[PDB]
Ligand binder design. Structure first.
Ligand SMILES: Cc1cc2nc3c(=O)[nH]c(=O)nc-3n(C[C@H](O)[C@H](O)[C@H](O)COP(=O)(O)OP(=O)(O)OC[C@H]3O[C@@H](n4cnc5c(N)ncnc54)[C@H](O)[C@@H]3O)c2cc1C
Length: 449
């Protein structure tokens, strides 16, 4: 056995796992499929103009305790993501402003929207974060889509449309392909849509100067860059009572334990001898990744903030996106970032690169004025077609799975253990979760030695 533990996957999670295992004294190796240490945290510090740019995850939540601790211990510094000003909703094509995310109460759709929002949170409490599958209403919830739930519950077409962008954007899927139990679970495990949907707090409250991929790179540096083997895609995993043997084509390694720290979908692209037990097998084969676009437009000044707008925006139909200010104090170019997912992604991916850009810029203009009409820099990053991430921002599940194999997300199969954000108890789908899943996997393994 070449080493104690081999961590497959060099994301925040795999990396956090290796730091932990390493600090505890175990011999460790991190085997990574492509040629970069970031996870779905992808950073180019000198790449683009204006400042460092993140193509993946970048927001640190106010309660993302493990991420903050780890980042800090690595010497990284945080800066507030929030911006002062009114938030913006583009509903039915009309521009609405909301002082402290407080829409005019007289707007016809507002009260039922609030009401439905409270409904969602209540449903999120009926099923929990720890054992959604064991919840009393698990069977009924996991048997229908979020789409059918919106149709049966809500009156206002506009409320329905708000919920849909929200789901299309937090997951990279549309309510028409997501299990209701699964979403109730998600809202529950990320502390409610209120935090899930924050604009200046909750999940979206801070950034790392320098880029999110740093926590990873820094770990590698701290742990011994030589320990991270890039371009080493694991394709077969032979595991017995003694340990595990990884194969990358002809090459191979041997360890006492392994932690596969990637999405279920991603892990499902690896052969396991012996075959994985059937619940984990189903879980991996049936838990897809979202369909997502991360657009970025930089300008010489924060004209949106300068005009009293926070840059935070929600649009139900022009494009189908959540906008957010992404300007660091340090940057030399103001930047607005937008996220398009699910069916909204489907929509645009069908258009041409330029059509997309035009449409996006048009929107920015409708919301913030003609200055948006012409950016200093524009970038789009299609996650649904990234080779190793294979999609959206997070994992999602169709009706029929979470309630039948959910536990497979966490339970180890012999000597192989599972990390990756999807295995976190809470904040699964976020870097925080990634960090937590990694550390818990590490501890489990530590204890086995
Ligand atoms: C556009 C976008 C925006 C996001 N924004 C945020 C945000 O603001 N805040 C937040 O908290 N989260 C955000 N996220 C999610 C966050 O990035 C992820 O939750 C987190 O990075 C997942 O980490 P991970 O370590 O579990 O997995 P990953 O980051 O997916 O890393 C898994 C690693 O495994 C490697 N791998 C895959 N297959 C193999 C194989 N066969 N052999 C070897 N290695 C393999 C991969 O290449 C990769 O490096 C966002 C995601 C996207 C796509």
């Amino acid at each position: 056995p070449d080493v104690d533990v081999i961590i497959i996957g060099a994301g925040i999670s795999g990396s956090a796992a290796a730091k932990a295992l390493h600090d505890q004294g175990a011999s460790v190796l991190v085997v990574e499929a492509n040629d970069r240490i970031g996870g779905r945290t992808w950073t180019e510090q000198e790449g683009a103009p204006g400042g460092p740019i993140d193509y993946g995850g970048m927001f640190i939540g106010e309660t993302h305790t493990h991420l903050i601790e780890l980042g800090t211990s690595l010497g990284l510094e945080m800066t507030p993501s929030g911006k002062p000003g009114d938030d913006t909703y583009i509903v039915a094509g009309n521009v609405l402003r909301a002082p402290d995310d407080q829409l005019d109460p007289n707007l016809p759709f507002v009260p039922e929207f609030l009401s439905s929002l409270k409904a969602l949170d209540e449903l999120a409490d009926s099923v929990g974060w720890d054992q959604p599958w064991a919840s009393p209403n698990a069977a009924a919830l996991d048997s229908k889509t979020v789409a059918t739930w919106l149709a049966e519950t809500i009156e206002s077409e506009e409320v329905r449309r708000l919920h849909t962008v929200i789901v299309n954007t937090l997951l990279g899927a549309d309510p028409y392909e997501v299990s209701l139990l699964y979403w109730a679970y998600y809202v529950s495990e990320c502390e409610g849509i209120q935090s899930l949907m924050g604009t200046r707090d909750g999940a979206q409250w801070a950034w790392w100067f320098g880029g999110a991929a740093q926590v990873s790179w820094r770990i590698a540096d701290a742990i011994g860059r030589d320990k991270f083997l890039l371009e080493w895609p694991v394709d077969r995993i032979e595991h017995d009572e003694s340990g595990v043997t990884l194969f990358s084509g002809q090459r191979s390694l041997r360890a006492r334990h392994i932690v596969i720290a990637m999405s279920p979908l991603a892990a499902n692209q690896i052969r396991f001898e012996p075959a994985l037990p059937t619940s984990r097998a189903q879980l991996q084969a049936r838990a897809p990744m979202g369909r997502y676009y991360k657009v970025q437009a930089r300008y010489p000044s924060s004209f949106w903030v300068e005009q009293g707008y926070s840059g935070a925006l929600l649009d139900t139909e022009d494009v189908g996106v959540f906008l957010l200010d992404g300007t660091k104090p340090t940057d030399t170019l103001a930047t607005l970032i937008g996220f398009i997912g699910g069916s909204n992604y489907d929509r645009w991916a069908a258009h041409t690169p330029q059509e997309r850009e035009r449409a996006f810029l048009d929107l920015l203009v409708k919301a913030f004025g003609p200055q948006a009409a012409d950016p200093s820099y524009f970038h789009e990053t299609d996650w649904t077609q990234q080779e190793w991430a294979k999609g959206g921002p997070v994992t999602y599940m169709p009706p029929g799975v979470l309630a039948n194999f959910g536990a497979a997300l966490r339970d180890p199969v012999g000597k192989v253990h599972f990390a990756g954000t999807e295995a976190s108890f809470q904040w699964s789908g976020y870097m925080e979760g990634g960090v937590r899943a990694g550390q818990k996997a590490a501890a489990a393994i530590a204890e086995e030695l």
